[PDB]
Structure formats: structure tokens, C-alpha cells
Design a protein around this ligand. Structure first.
Ligand SMILES: *[C@@H]1O[C@H](CO)[C@@H](O[C@@H]2O[C@H](CO)[C@@H](O[C@@H]3O[C@H](CO)[C@@H](O)[C@H](O)[C@@H]3O)[C@H](O)[C@H]2NC(C)=O)[C@H](O)[C@H]1NC(C)=O
Ligand SMILES: *[C@@H]1O[C@H](CO)[C@@H](O[C@@H]2O[C@H](CO)[C@@H](O)[C@H](O)[C@H]2NC(C)=O)[C@H](O)[C@H]1NC(C)=O
Ligand SMILES: *[C@@H]1O[C@H](CO)[C@@H](O[C@@H]2O[C@H](CO)[C@@H](O)[C@H](O)[C@H]2NC(C)=O)[C@H](O)[C@H]1NC(C)=O
Ligand SMILES: *[C@@H]1O[C@H](CO)[C@@H](O)[C@H](O)[C@H]1NC(C)=O
Ligand SMILES: *[C@@H]1O[C@H](CO)[C@@H](O)[C@H](O)[C@H]1NC(C)=O
Ligand SMILES: *[C@@H]1O[C@H](CO)[C@@H](O)[C@H](O)[C@H]1NC(C)=O
Ligand SMILES: [Zn+2]
Lengths: 596, 195
């Protein structure tokens, strides 16, 4: 018997073994997230421990099948994922060293508190304490305190750990035959052995930077418009030509400019579309929100949710005594068990989230027939991209009118579209330079292109140069400001949010093209369009079986990540911003900082 | 009026694992096939070669009811010319199979919150089964070229894997009880009619 058919048989054993053990881990995790008791923690960890221990055993046994003598390229993919997982690549001490560093950094982030001046009694966590300040406070000094306090008393804690975190992660990636830990992360987009669809790890850098260059005009005009609106509200604090202060961007880091909408709304007299009242007027409950969300995917030829979805999911907060983790999540436990965990309120926000999370389910149900190791999005950005394009269509006035949540008397004028698109750009466009610059900094740190004595120096040079954002307080190398963000300290790749953003507008534009949608892309609803659903399903069913370049092609007809549909989405805003910045300076100076 | 024991086959408390599929020979009795409707929606009541529609006034030499349990997605494999883990390694029907295949959901019975590992299936076998062949051997499957020595290890897999039926499983993975009525026709007295 050959070495390939041995591996085919090995994966056959693994899949049946993995699905059963993964279901136990997932169901125990589900029971904790819906019923918070110390037993449910113990059960969840007990099944979680048996799951990781199962994978480490199966990863080591997978390494005994060498990849080079396997031609099937679907066995090779499944084995490659299994062999890659095994972190026996590092010494158990260094593996234990790193895990303690990861746990300490995660604990420092999640439990890190800061207490106010002239009163050491009242202390504030990031959630909800400091996040509430950075999201709602209009007071410059209060936001400056919460911004500086978080980085000085939590970021400085994370600096010595992150330095060693870089050394061990690089040591792991190098012995995994990657250039560095950043090269390891970019391997999620790597494709080999497929003629015409291959994709190198370094090509992601070229593609991210190339697509980002086409974003800069849209961002610079959005940055200039946001700066002009903020400068009106903060004349003494913001230069008309300088970067935006980092603490005035609507959250702790400027990751999203969403909460600048109040100070940057183009037409504050326009009331914004909120069907929350109409839902309460029609006595909508949470089950109605998902039943309508279900109906949305049925309208595009996607199956209605399984019976186990309705019986076993949690769509309301159990409230009272029984505690639950209310973060909206779509659960694919395997074995045909698809669940959504959401504490749904009767609001437009949760209504969109239900479509977004059920979009994840539709993805999960589509590739359920795939092998277990291929049961995932085509790459890290695909799954969340599928969810976003559901809220895009669900939030359009055309969709809201067709479902009785928006009166036909309502008529959208060109101003409410600009108001909507501006709010979208603050979140969607505003995160792109933040996302690219942060991941670039990590890529250069892992590459060694930034010395330890220049981490914060480069980090804020890139913030000024790339994001147009300036630190309000000079930061020495005792600070670790990137680690003050969850993804950096909790060891999560970040370029996925850049690629997913571009993917979702590639997805929507292709689906709206399939939906025969006439008009601007941002008004598009793919509802009642089975052509769009089949086009989307052609990629959803693939999962990880096929290269993400081909999976993208099954929707948009292009093998590579493209930024043009994103600019198509925001084009009415882009033309509006350029006119609105006709007597304003577009761009920013890095030499200006709010500390004279 | 000596009534055939379809009660013992269909209604039974615990069905056999599909790798060790049960077989109950039925002879010298009246076969009231209208009782064979528990009416609880039989996922499959598809018969081959013989019409199910009120065609029980026909007589057969012997009737073989093969009862077992599989999951929902594998009920398709209980049919002539079908392939997959069940048809290849657990229960194979001939291409010219003359008989009925009756399957229904048994999630209420054969599932368990902690997982029902009673029902097994054959995951590996050196070759496909002949029609109506049964393999209950638990010899460790040798995938590699090294001797297994009767224990599990690298390239040495225990041939049987459990379903782990849980009530929360999707329909495709839910337990389904299956009865396969085989109908024999020899140059023989043909001692099963059921008018
Ligand atoms: C790489 O390996 C996979 C399997 O790991 C190959 O897919 C499998 O290909 C076989 C045929 O070589 C399929 O068996 C056939 O299935 C159909 C439908 O059930 C049935 O009608 C036939 O009688 C036959 O049994 C099998 O279904 C298919 N899928 C799986 C999951 O095994 C794949 O073709 C290989 N690719 C290359 C390039 O070698
Ligand atoms: C929204 O639409 C209105 C009406 O189409 C625009 O107002 C017109 O703008 C043109 C300039 O191209 C003027 O010549 C007209 O006199 C304007 N009409 C009125 C009634 O004011 C308005 O400019 C648009 N605004 C935005 C932000 O797109
Ligand atoms: C299995 O047992 C059930 C009863 O436990 C049988 O269902 C009965 O079938 C008869 C015949 O048509 C009906 O008159 C009864 O009303 C049914 N009762 C119930 C509770 O369903 C069923 O037929 C049995 N199956 C076999 C194959 O013997
Ligand atoms: C929650 O768990 C406790 C003990 O862990 C159990 O007694 C209780 O019935 C559970 N309740 C729900 C709603 O799951
Ligand atoms: C919806 O679910 C039911 C479940 O009984 C199923 O019969 C039906 O085919 C599903 N979808 C449609 C479009 O009917
Ligand atoms: C979809 O079709 C249904 C049924 O014809 C109709 O009631 C609904 O308004 C349509 N919605 C859209 C967005 O086309
Ligand atoms: Zn999501």
C-alpha cells in the first residue's frame, strides 16, 4: 500500500474521531455560554482539554505521513492543516513559556484596570469602563486620560511580555520553515500546486499595499472631512493640516470611526433610518427576527434553518438567574447541529446581526458535506465577509420596505444616502488604514525590521504616516500601544479585517450584478434573487476544499482580492467628500502633535 | 391465521449495529404488511422489484428482515448499486435486490444527551462486502505495510467507529432504524402469503 492511500485512511479515521470529539467540545462550550455554572466551565474545559489533546496526538501521527509523496491535493491540504497545528515544533519549555506569556497578556488585557486621578477608589476596566469613555465622551481631557491611562498602566505591562512573545513566535515560525511569525500568519492565504490559482505568502503584502494605495484617496478625503468636523468641535485641539489625535476617534484605538458620526454627520437634520420602533409597533419578538432572516436566505434559494436550529439555539436572553454570554455567535458544532447564540433585542441592530450571523450558518451548512478539516471559510476573511453582505442587503430601505418595517411613504433622498454612506465609511473605510498599518507594524516587527528600541517610535511614525493619526502624549519604548488592542495581545491576526472588508464588497457587487440590481451598489438588496444565492452558494459549498482564489472566482469572476467594488460602494460619498473638502486641506502632516 | 413476527423486528427495543446487522428469517406465517405501517413517518418505504401498493397477496418462499441502525445521510446507501461506508463495509444489497427498505427516525430512542455509543459501523475493510455479507470481525485494520499485532497505533486502526448519537444532531446525523425485507423465490412451497 502506498503512502497516500495510508493518509487517506488516516484522514478517514481522523474525521470520524474528530467530529465526535469536536461536537463534545462544542456542545460543552455551548452549554457554558448559555448556562454559566462552575460545573459548565469544568465540563467545557474537560471536553476542550480532550479536544486539543486529541489534535496534538493526531497532529503528531499526521506528521508521520510526509507531504511530498501525496498527489491528491485534497488529502495534502487536509494533512497540511493537521501537521501544521502541532506546536511540538517548539520545546515544551518554550511552548510552556509562550503559553504563560499568552495567558498573562490575555489576562492583563481582560482584567487590566485604571483608577481615576484624585480618587484612587473608583477604577475602570476597558469593558465597559474605558470603552464607554472612548465611545461616548466628548470631553477631550477625559478621553485623553482613558487613552493614555490604558496604554501606560496596561500597555507598559504588556511590553516585556510582547518582546518575548515575538521571540518565541518567531522561533516557532522559523522551525515551521516560515520567515517569521508574520510570514506564518500570511500562510492562511497561501495556495500551492494549483496552476493559475496559486498565491504566495509575500503576495499578500503586495496585494494589501497595492489595494490600499487605491483606498488612500477615499480615506484622505474622509480623514480630511472628519478632521474638519472635529476641528469645528475642537478648535483648540486639532490642526487643520495635522493628524487626528488618537483619543478623539470614537474608540480606544481609532480602529473604527463609528462613534464620530454625531460630530461628523453630514446632515444632522436627517433622522437616520431606524426600524426599531416599527418592530416594536408590530410586536416583533426575537423568533420573528430570525424567521424573517430565515425567509431572506430562502428567497435566494438557500435552505431554511434546520429543526435543530430552532429547538437548540438561544435567540433570547434567558435572563433572571441563568447567566449567558451575550456575544452574537453562529455555532457549527458539526453533526448537522447549527445554532445561533444571541441575546436578541427587538432592534434594527440585532435584526441586521441575525442576518449576519445566519449568513455564517448558511456558510456552515453549505460546506458541511466537506471533510472536517475543510469545514471553514475559504480563508480567514471569507466567513465574516459572508456575514457582512447579509446586513448590507437587510439594512437597505428596499429590503426594509418590502418586509413592512419601513413605510412606503418613506422616500430616500440623496442626503440620507450620504448620511448612511458616511456612517459606513467611518466603520468600514476608517478601519482599513488602521488595520493595514497595525498588521504592517507586526509584520515588520516579526521580520526584525523594527528594533525593540524603535517599536513605539516606528508604531507612531506609521500611525501618523499611514492612518493620519497622532498620539496625544509622547510614548517611549516602555509603552506597547499595539498590545493595548485585543487582537495584538491575544495573538490574533489582523489583516483578516482588511481582506474581509474588500471581500464583502466584491461579494455584494457580484451578487447585485447577479441580482440585476439597477442603481448605486449601496442600495442593493439580493433578496428574491436565486441567481445571487446560487452564485454565492457555489463558493459557500467549497469551504476550504478549494483555493480561496478560486472560491473568490466562483462569486466575483476574479481570482484576486480587488478594491474596486469597495470604492464603487462609497463612490457617492467619495464624490461628496471631494466637493466638501474643496476649501479644506486633504492629507495630513506627521510633524504636528497636540503636545506643542 | 398464523401471524408473522414483524413486531419483534420493527418494534424492537434495541436494533443491531449496522456492521453486526441483525437478520430474522420469517417463514410459515401470514405476513400482514399493512401492520408494518407504524405510520410514524417512515423516511424510506421504497421497495425494489415488487410494488408496495397492496401487493401483499403475493407469496414468497422466505422473508428475511435485516434490521440495523445508521445515520440519516447513510439511508441512501440501503439500495442496489450504492456505495459508501455502509454499503461497502457494513450492509450491501445486490444489484437485482427484490425487497423493501424501511427506515425511520429513532432520535427519541437511539440518541442520548451524553452520546449513545451503542451503535457502531465499519469504517475500514480490506474489500467491499458481497451482497448480504456480514463482517463482525474486530481485527485491527492494517493501513500501513507493518504488522499491526492486534492493537491500535500508527496505520493500525480499529475497524469500527461509533455514531455517538445525540438528540441535538442534525437530521443527516440522527439515528435511523432500518429494516430490509428480502423476498426469496425458490422452486419451493412458498410458505409466506398473508392474504
Ligand atoms: C482525491 O481524493 C478524493 C477522496 O479522498 C477523491 O474524491 C473521491 O473520488 C472517488 C472516486 O475516485 C469517489 O468515489 C465515487 O463516488 C461516487 C459518488 O458517491 C460513486 O457514484 C462512485 O461509484 C464512486 O464510489 C468519491 O465519492 C470521491 N469523494 C470522496 C469524499 O471520497 C478525489 O477524486 C481525489 N482527487 C484526485 C485529483 O485524485
Ligand atoms: C441633493 O439633490 C438636490 C436636488 O437634486 C441638489 O440640489 C441641487 O443642486 C444643483 C447642483 O448640481 C443645483 O443646481 C440645484 O439648484 C439644487 N437644487 C435645489 C432645489 O437646491 C443637492 O445639491 C444634492 N445634495 C447632495 C449632497 O448630493
Ligand atoms: C409497532 O408497535 C406499534 C404499537 O406500539 C404498532 O402501531 C399500531 O399499529 C396498529 C396496526 O395498524 C394500529 O391499529 C395501532 O393503532 C397502532 N398503535 C400505535 C400506538 O401506533 C405498529 O404497527 C408496530 N409495528 C410493527 C411493524 O409491528
Ligand atoms: C444550568 O446548570 C445547572 C447546573 O450546572 C442545572 O442544574 C440547571 O438545570 C441548568 N439550567 C439550564 C437552563 O440549563
Ligand atoms: C422548509 O422546511 C420544511 C421542513 O418540513 C421543508 O419541507 C421545506 O422543503 C423547506 N424549504 C422550502 C423552501 O420548502
Ligand atoms: C420578494 O417576493 C415576495 C413575494 O412575491 C414579495 O412579497 C416581496 O415584497 C419581495 N421582496 C423583494 C425585496 O423583492
Ligand atoms: Zn459574524
Amino acid at each position: 500500500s502506498t503512502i497516500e492511500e495510508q493518509a487517506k485512511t488516516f484522514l478517514d479515521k481522523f474525521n470520524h474521531e474528530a467530529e465526535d470529539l469536536f461536537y463534545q467540545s462544542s456542545l460543552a462550550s455551548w452549554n457554558y455560554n448559555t448556562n454559566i455554572t462552575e460545573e459548565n466551565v469544568q465540563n467545557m474545559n474537560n471536553a476542550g482539554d480532550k479536544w486539543s489533546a486529541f489534535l496534538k496526538e493526531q497532529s503528531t501521527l499526521a506528521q508521520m505521513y510526509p507531504l511530498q509523496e501525496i498527489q491528491n491535493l485534497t488529502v495534502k491540504l487536509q494533512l497540511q492543516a493537521l501537521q501544521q497545528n502541532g506546536s511540538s515544533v517548539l520545546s515544551e519549555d518554550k511552548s510552556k513559556r509562550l503559553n504563560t506569556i499568552l495567558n498573562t497578556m490575555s489576562t492583563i488585557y481582560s482584567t487590566g484596570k485604571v483608577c481615576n486621578p484624585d480618587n484612587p477608589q473608583e477604577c475602570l476596566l476597558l469593558e465597559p469602563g474605558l470603552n464607554e469613555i472612548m465611545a461616548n465622551s466628548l470631553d477631550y481631557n477625559e478621553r485623553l486620560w482613558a487613552w493614555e491611562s490604558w496604554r501606560s498602566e496596561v500597555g507598559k505591562q504588556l511590553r516585556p511580555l510582547y518582546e518575548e512573545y515575538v521571540v518565541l513566535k518567531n522561533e516557532m515560525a522559523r522551525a515551521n520553515h516560515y520567515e517569521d511569525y508574520g510570514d506564518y500568519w500570511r500562510g492562511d492565504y497561501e495556495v500551492n500546486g494549483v496552476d493559475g490559482y496559486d498565491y504566495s505568502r509575500g503576495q499578500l503584502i503586495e496585494d494589501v499595499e497595492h489595494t490600499f494605495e487605491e483606498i488612500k484617496p477615499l480615506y484622505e478625503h474622509l480623514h480630511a472631512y472628519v478632521r474638519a468636523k472635529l476641528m469645528n468641535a475642537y478648535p483648540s485641539y486639532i490642526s487643520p493640516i495635522g493628524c487626528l489625535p488618537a483619543h478623539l476617534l470614537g474608540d480606544m484605538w481609532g480602529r473604527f470611526w463609528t462613534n464620530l458620526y454625531s460630530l461628523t454627520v453630514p446632515f444632522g437634520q436627517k433622522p437616520n433610518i431606524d426600524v426599531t420602533d416599527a418592530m416594536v409597533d408590530q410586536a416583533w419578538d426575537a423568533q420573528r427576527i430570525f424567521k424573517e432572516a430565515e425567509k431572506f436566505f430562502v428567497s435566494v434559494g438557500l435552505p431554511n434553518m434546520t429543526q435543530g436550529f430552532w429547538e437548540n439555539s438561544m435567540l433570547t436572553d434567558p435572563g433572571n438567574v441563568q447567566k449567558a454570554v451575550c456575544h452574537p455567535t453562529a455555532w457549527d458544532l458539526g453533526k448537522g447541529d447549527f445554532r445561533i447564540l444571541m441575546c436578541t433585542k427587538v432592534t434594527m441592530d440585532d435584526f441586521l446581526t441575525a442576518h449576519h450571523e445566519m449568513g455564517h450558518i448558511q456558510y456552515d451548512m453549505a460546506y458541511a458535506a466537506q471533510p472536517f478539516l475543510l469545514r471553514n471559510g475559504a480563508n480567514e476573511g471569507f466567513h465574516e465577509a459572508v456575514g457582512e453582505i447579509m446586513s448590507l442587503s437587510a439594512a437597505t430601505p428596499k429590503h426594509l420596505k418590502s418586509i413592512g418595517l419601513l413605510s412606503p411613504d418613506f422616500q430616500e433622498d440623496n442626503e440620507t444616502e450620504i448620511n448612511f454612506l458616511l456612517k459606513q465609511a467611518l466603520t468600514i473605510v476608517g478601519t482599513l488604514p488602521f488595520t493595514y498599518m497595525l498588521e504592517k507594524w507586526r509584520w515588520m516587527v516579526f521580520k526584525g525590521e523594527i528594533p525593540k528600541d524603535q517599536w513605539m517610535k516606528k508604531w507612531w511614525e506609521m500611525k501618523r504616516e499611514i492612518v493620519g493619526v497622532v498620539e496625544p502624549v509622547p510614548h517611549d519604548e516602555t509603552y506597547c500601544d499595539p498590545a493595548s488592542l485585543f487582537h495584538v495581545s491575544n495573538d490574533y491576526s489582523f489583516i483578516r479585517y482588511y481582506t474581509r472588508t474588500l471581500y464583502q464588497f466584491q461579494f455584494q457587487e457580484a451578487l447585485c450584478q447577479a441580482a440585476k440590481h439597477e442603481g448605486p451598489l449601496h442600495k442593493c438588496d439580493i433578496s428574491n434573487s436565486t441567481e445571487a444565492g446560487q452564485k454565492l452558494f457555489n463558493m459557500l459549498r467549497l469551504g476550504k476544499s478549494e483555493p480561496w482564489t478560486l472560491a473568490l472566482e466562483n462569486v466575483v469572476g476574479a481570482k484576486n482580492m480587488n478594491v474596486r467594488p469597495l470604492l464603487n460602494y462609497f463612490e457617492p460619498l467619495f464624490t461628496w467628500l471631494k466637493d466638501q473638502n474643496k476649501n479644506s486641506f486633504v492629507g495630513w502632516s506627521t510633524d504636528w502633535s497636540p503636545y506643542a | 391465521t398464523n401471524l408473522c413476527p414483524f413486531d419483534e423486528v420493527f418494534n424492537a427495543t434495541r436494533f443491531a449495529s449496522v456492521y453486526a446487522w441483525n437478520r430474522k428469517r420469517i417463514s410459515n406465517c401470514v405476513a400482514d404488511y399493512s401492520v408494518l405501517y407504524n405510520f410514524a413517518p417512515f423516511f424510506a418505504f421504497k421497495c425494489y422489484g415488487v410494488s408496495p401498493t397492496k401487493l401483499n397477496d403475493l407469496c414468497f418462499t422466505n422473508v428475511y428482515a435485516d434490521s440495523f441502525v445508521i445515520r440519516g445521510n447513510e439511508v441512501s446507501q440501503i439500495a442496489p448499486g450504492q456505495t459508501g461506508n455502509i454499503a461497502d463495509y457494513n450492509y450491501k444489497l445486490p444489484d437485482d435486490f427484490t425487497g423493501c427498505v424501511i427506515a425511520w427516525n429513532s432520535n427519541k430512542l437511539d440518541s442520548k444527551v451524553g452520546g449513545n455509543y451503542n451503535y457502531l459501523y465499519r469504517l475500514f475493510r480490506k474489500s467491499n462486502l458481497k451482497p448480504f455479507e456480514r463482517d463482525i470481525s474486530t481485527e485491527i485494520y492494517q493501513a500501513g505495510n507493518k504488522p499491526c499485532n492486534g492493537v491500535a497505533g500508527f496505520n493500525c486502526y480499529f475497524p469500527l467507529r461509533s455514531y455517538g448519537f445525540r438528540p441535538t444532531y442534525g437530521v443527516g446525523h440522527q439515528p435511523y432504524r432500518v429494516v430490509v425485507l428480502s423476498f426469496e423465490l425458490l422452486h419451493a412451497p412458498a410458505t409466506v402469503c398473508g392474504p
